[PDB]
Structure formats: structure tokens, C-alpha cells
Amino acid sequence: MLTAEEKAAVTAFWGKVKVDEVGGEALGRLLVVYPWTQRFFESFGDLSTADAVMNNPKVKAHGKKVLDSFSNGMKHLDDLKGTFAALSELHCDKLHVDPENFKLLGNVLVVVLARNFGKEFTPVLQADFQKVVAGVANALAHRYH
């Protein structure tokens, strides 16, 4: 995947990322922006609106879990296939999430970092990040391909 040069940049910037906040924001944007994803999150309660979604405690809670698994993915960045094999089994085999949605999340994730970091998250630095989020998406979709 990344070279050494890129793999370092990605690890330094990621160090600066506030996991509580960013995970919840990304999950919630996903529910808000691609509304059908909400159907996987009915149990989650009121997801009627943006305000509802963003302020749902379970959403906020779930976002964390997600970013946490990402942060771990960022530690096993050369074996994402391995790092995510369980999660691939769950999302794919149990939940029945279509893998096109995994791209959507990784993409949403990218917009969130850029919101929170502005000029700090540079064209150069985002490019490297898109390769990560695609790997994790590919890794997650492993039980299909």
C-alpha cells in the first residue's frame, strides 16, 4: 500500500485526530447524506432528521467504535485484509451491507477530517488518505471478492 514516506505522514496526522468527535460526525453525516443507510440503524431510534441523527446518543456511541477499528486498521496498514476479516464476515455475512456503502463511509470520513482540519489536511495529505480508506473498504468487502 503506502510507501514508508506516506505511511509516516498518515500516522503523524492521525495522531492529531480526536476519535470521539470525528467518528460520530462521520457516522452521522453518512446517515444524513445517504439516507437509506438509516435502515441498518432503525434500533438506533429517532433518525427522522439531521438534528435527530447528529444528536442520537447511539450514533455518537457507534461512530467511536468505527473510528476505533479504523485507528487499529492504521496500525495493521499492510494487512488490512487480515485486520478486517472478522468485520468483513459481520458486515457482509450477517448485516448484508452492500459494499458500495463502505466507500461512502471512507469518503465521508475524508470530508470530516477536512472540515475539522481545514488547511492542515492538504491535497497532498488527503490523497494518501484516500488510499487508506479504499484499502479498508476493499478489506471490509473481502467476503464478496
Binding site: 453525516r29 439516507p35 470530508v111 470530516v112 472540515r115
Partner: protein, 141 residues
């Protein structure tokens, strides 16, 4: 197909971009060729070097095209004919590429307008761009 609310939110968002529309235009292209290198194969005649005045002037053209679209949200086909002609008939741009620029633009808008880039605005802008993209990628002349 956009809500009244989506068109509200798109107008709102685009007033804020205001006069940096060309700037953000350039930055989104710049982010797209960097992040998605294959998109470059469509600009073999371009200076694609960082800071190229050619990329800058083209972003002006793309943003200028989007602002036209914001004013003609009820008849995008009619507004964007000449541009479908180019993108679909002449250039024959693979549809996925429009996803890549749209994402890029969203990245761009997010980083310059953290306050205004609310999830709701995000949703509306996303829909807007998928609508523009469908237009440039249909052969309806």
C-alpha cells in the same frame, strides 16, 4: 431529484462560496488529479504540475459552470446542454469520474466552510452534484 429544501441549501451554500468559486474550483481539480491519477488521462494536453496556471484557469471554468447550474436548478438539462454535448458526446467521460470530482469539491468546500458545511448542506450539495453529473453524462440532444 432535489427538495425545495435542497435547492434552498444549495443557494445558501453557493452565496458563501461567492467570489472564491474559481479558487475552490481549481482546488477541487487539483485534489482530484492528485488523489485519483487516472483522471489525468483526460487532460493529456494540460500542464498538470502543482500550481499550473492552466489548472487554475480551468477551475474558473468549472466553478463558473456550477454557478450557472445553481441559478438554473429547475432546468439543468436546458442550462447544461452545451456541456453534456462536450462531456457525454465529444469527451465520453466515464461516469465514475464525476463521482471523483464531486467528492473532491465536497472535500474543498468542507475545508473552507467548516461552519456552513453542516451535514444538511452536505446532503444537499451531494444531491446537486449527482444531478449535474447525470446531466453531463446523458446523451439527450
Amino acid at each position: 431529484v432535489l427538495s425545495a429544501a435542497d435547492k434552498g441549501n444549495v443557494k445558501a451554500a453557493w452565496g458563501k462560496v461567492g467570489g472564491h468559486a474559481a479558487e475552490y474550483g481549481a482546488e477541487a481539480l487539483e485534489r482530484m488529479f492528485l488523489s485519483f491519477p487516472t483522471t489525468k488521462t483526460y487532460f493529456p494536453h494540460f500542464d498538470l504540475s502543482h500550481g499550473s496556471a492552466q489548472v487554475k484557469g480551468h477551475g474558473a471554468k468549472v466553478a463558473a459552470a456550477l454557478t450557472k447550474a445553481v441559478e438554473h436548478l429547475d432546468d439543468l438539462p436546458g442550462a447544461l446542454s452545451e456541456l453534456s454535448d462536450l462531456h457525454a458526446h465529444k469527451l465520453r467521460v466515464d461516469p465514475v469520474n464525476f463521482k471523483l470530482l464531486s467528492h473532491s469539491l465536497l472535500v474543498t468546500l468542507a475545508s473552507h466552510l467548516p461552519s456552513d458545511f453542516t451535514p444538511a448542506v452536505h446532503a444537499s450539495l451531494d444531491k446537486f452534484l449527482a444531478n449535474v453529473s447525470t446531466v453531463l453524462t446523458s446523451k439527450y440532444r
